[PDB]
């Protein structure tokens, strides 16, 4: 049928993963999405995590590249402290409260859309914020929100093949970005340097600059 996360072995592939979902490879050994509503919730969480990880990884990479060039851009693991230091008039609690409030407003809009697929496409919002659906055969709401604001270029409007290709691109890049952020955290905790720093130090000296020489992954070495 479709490519699996483990060639052959159809027993490990769950029944609820029939291949209709984007990025479906039958991966669910722990059965964390056995329930239907749990599967829908996990789909929303996965796409949201992928987009958030892509944004964070892109920002971290760009800041690390700027820091290497000599710009007054701090590293990702110290950007918050640095900004708080150059701006002593900004209260940390105030910034946290503002972030929580604004994120709460948008997250509540998304949450209500999750509860009711097409309930936010009216009132104080146009029909564009109603969603186009997709997962679980839905035709409204979901993580894929079309419209003229979340898709100004209209890449998903016209030719379903292009829409499917872009959706696969998005999910694959999101998973890759999630793994990239995990690697960023592990590398910072082991070597204490940024991503670009680790990459340049490794390219300069391939052998002697692996995870075994950081002194953290392999303790006795």
């Amino acid at each position: 049928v479709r490519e699996l996360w483990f060639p052959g072995n159809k027993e490990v592939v769950p029944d609820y993963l029939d291949g209709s979902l984007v990025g479906d490879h039958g991966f669910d050994p722990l059965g964390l999405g056995s329930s239907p509503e749990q599967l829908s919730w996990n789909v929303h969480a996965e796409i949201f995590h992928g987009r958030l990880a892509m944004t964070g990884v892109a920002g971290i990479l760009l800041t690390s590249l700027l820091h290497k060039g000599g710009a007054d851009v701090p590293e990702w693991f110290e950007a918050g402290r640095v900004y708080l230091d150059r701006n002593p008039n900004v209260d940390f609690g105030a910034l946290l409260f503002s972030t929580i409030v604004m994120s709460g407003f948008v997250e509540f809009k998304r949450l209500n859309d999750i509860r009711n697929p097409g309930s936010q496409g009216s009132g104080i919002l146009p029909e564009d914020f109603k969603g186009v659906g997709g997962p679980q055969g839905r035709t409204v709401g979901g993580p894929y929100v079309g419209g003229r604001y979340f898709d100004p270029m209209g890449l998903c409007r016209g030719s379903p093949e292009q829409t499917l290709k872009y959706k696969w691109n998005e999910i694959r890049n999101g998973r890759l970005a999630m793994m990239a952020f995990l690697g960023f955290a592990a590398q910072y905790a082991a070597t204490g340097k940024g991503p670009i720093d680790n990459l340049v130090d490794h390219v300069a000296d391939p052998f002697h600059t692996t995870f075994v020489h950081n002194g953290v992954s392999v303790p006795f070495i």
């Binding site: 900004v90 105030a94 009132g123």
Partner: protein, 219 residues
């Protein structure tokens, strides 16, 4: 039915529907499930909103005038003490008892009106003034003596709009008074002073830096 709700996408509870002014389907605690309890809470909301509106007006307008220069009055938290040290100042206990004695009569009469709207219109109750004590059918909206200018009497929809404006203003004033209390307790300054201090440096002057809202033990 399809009127705006407090949380878009969430269906309003069946016990609220959409007839009372200010009905936005907001009842996460399901406090107004009982009809009698809902009616009592509606009357309580109207009373609290009107009293809060009067208090917030008497606290903001005099403060705004004082800031300009005309009409010099003390800050609302010190107004009670300022009058106490006056020469012919009435004792606090006597003043409070007189106010409570008058309020006892008026509030008990309003209480009887809540149980039965046409209660106070009983013939012979007063010296011919009971005729003007008949409500409009809903407790909390008594015409006659009250509403001497007859605003909103042109039609039923006109009165409904005014009721919505009254409920929104009352709720806003209630929240404003709670804010006044919290602001003065956290910062020993007036509302206008707090507003002016916040605009000067919003990121450095707010509830996160007053030292009271956020406990110092956590930090």
């Amino acid at each position: 039915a399809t009127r705006p709700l407090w949380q878009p996408g969430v269906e309003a509870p069946k016990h609220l529907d959409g007839t009372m002014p200010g009905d936005f389907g907001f009842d996460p605690l399901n406090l107004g499930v009982n009809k009698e309890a809902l009616n009592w809470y509606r009357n309580a909301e109207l009373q609290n909103g009107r009293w809060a509106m009067l208090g917030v007006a008497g606290i903001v307008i005099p403060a705004e005038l004082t800031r300009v220069g005309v009409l010099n009055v003390p800050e609302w938290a010190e107004a009670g003490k300022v009058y106490a040290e006056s020469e012919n100042a009435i004792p606090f206990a006597s003043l409070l008892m007189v106010q409570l004695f008058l309020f006892n009569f008026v509030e008990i009469k309003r209480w009887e009106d809540i149980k039965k709207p046409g209660s106070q219109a009983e013939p012979g109750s007063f010296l011919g003034f009971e005729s003007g004590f008949k409500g409009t059918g809903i407790s909390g909206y008594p015409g006659g003596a009250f509403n001497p200018f007859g605003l909103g009497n042109s039609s039923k929809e006109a009165m409904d709009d005014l009721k919505w404006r009254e409920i929104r203003n009352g709720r806003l004033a209630m929240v404003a008074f709670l804010g006044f209390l919290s602001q003065h307790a956290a910062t020993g300054k007036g509302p206008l002073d707090n507003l002016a201090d916040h605009l000067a440096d919003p990121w450095g002057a707010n509830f996160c830096s007053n030292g009271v809202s956020i406990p110092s033990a956590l930090g």
